[PDB]
Amino acid sequence: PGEASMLRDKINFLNIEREKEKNIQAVKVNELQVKHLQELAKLKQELQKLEDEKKFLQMEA
Amino acid sequence: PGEASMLRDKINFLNIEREKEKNIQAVKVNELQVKHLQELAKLKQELQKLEDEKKFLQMEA
C-alpha cells in the first residue's frame, strides 16, 4: 500500500508542476510581446517623423 | 502491487508529456520571433527608403 501512496503524491506534484510551468511560459511570451510592441512603436514613430520631414521638403516648391 | 504499476505508468506518460509540451512552446515562441523579425525588417527597409528620399530632396539646393 505504501509504494502506491508515494506514487499518488508524485502524480499530484507533477499536476501542479505542469500548471506552474505553463505560467512561466506565459510570462516569457508576455515579455517577448511587450518588447516587440515597444520596438515596433519606436520604429513607427521614426517613420512618421521622416514622412512629415519629406512632406515638408516636397512642400518647398 | 497492481495499483503501483498503474501509477508508475502514469508517471512515465507525464514525464514524456512535459517534454512534448516544452517542444510545442518552443515552436510557438519560434513562430512569434520569426513573425517579429519579418515585421521589423519590413519597417527597417521602409525607413531606409525614406532616409534616402529625404537625402535626395535635401540634395536639391
Side-chain angles (χ1 to χ4, degrees):
Chain A
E3 208 200 320
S5 62
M6 288 301 291
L7 299 159
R8 286 195 302 274
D9 293 355
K10 182 99 173 80
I11 283 154
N12 293 331
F13 164 77
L14 290 166
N15 284 331
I16 299 166
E17 181 184 60
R18 173 175 54 261
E19 299 307 326
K20 289 183 159 169
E21 190 63 60
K22 179 166 147 57
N23 177 106
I24 282 142
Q25 299 312 312
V27 170
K28 182 168 111 185
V29 162
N30 303 327
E31 290 170 15
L32 258 191
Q33 282 177 308
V34 167
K35 198 184 89 80
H36 300 134
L37 275 164
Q38 287 173 344
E39 192 58 85
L40 224 69
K42 197 196 168 179
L43 294 179
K44 285 162 182 187
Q45 222 171 293
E46 209 184 321
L47 276 155
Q48 201 176 76
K49 193 203 81 154
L50 281 161
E51 271 160 38
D52 294 327
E53 253 160 32
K54 195 204 85 157
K55 177 184 84 74
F56 149 76
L57 285 160
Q58 287 190 330
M59 203 144 62
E60 268 206 304
Chain B
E3 208 200 320
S5 62
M6 288 301 291
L7 299 159
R8 286 195 302 274
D9 293 355
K10 182 99 173 80
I11 283 154
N12 293 331
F13 164 77
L14 290 166
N15 284 331
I16 299 166
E17 181 184 60
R18 173 175 54 261
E19 299 307 326
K20 289 183 159 169
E21 190 63 60
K22 179 166 147 57
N23 177 106
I24 282 142
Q25 299 312 312
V27 170
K28 182 168 111 185
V29 162
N30 303 327
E31 290 170 15
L32 258 191
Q33 282 177 308
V34 167
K35 198 184 89 80
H36 300 134
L37 275 164
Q38 287 173 344
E39 192 58 85
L40 224 69
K42 197 196 168 179
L43 294 179
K44 285 162 182 187
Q45 222 171 293
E46 209 184 321
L47 276 155
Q48 201 176 76
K49 193 203 81 154
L50 281 161
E51 271 160 38
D52 294 327
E53 253 160 32
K54 195 204 85 157
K55 177 184 84 74
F56 149 76
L57 285 160
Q58 287 190 330
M59 203 144 62
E60 268 206 304

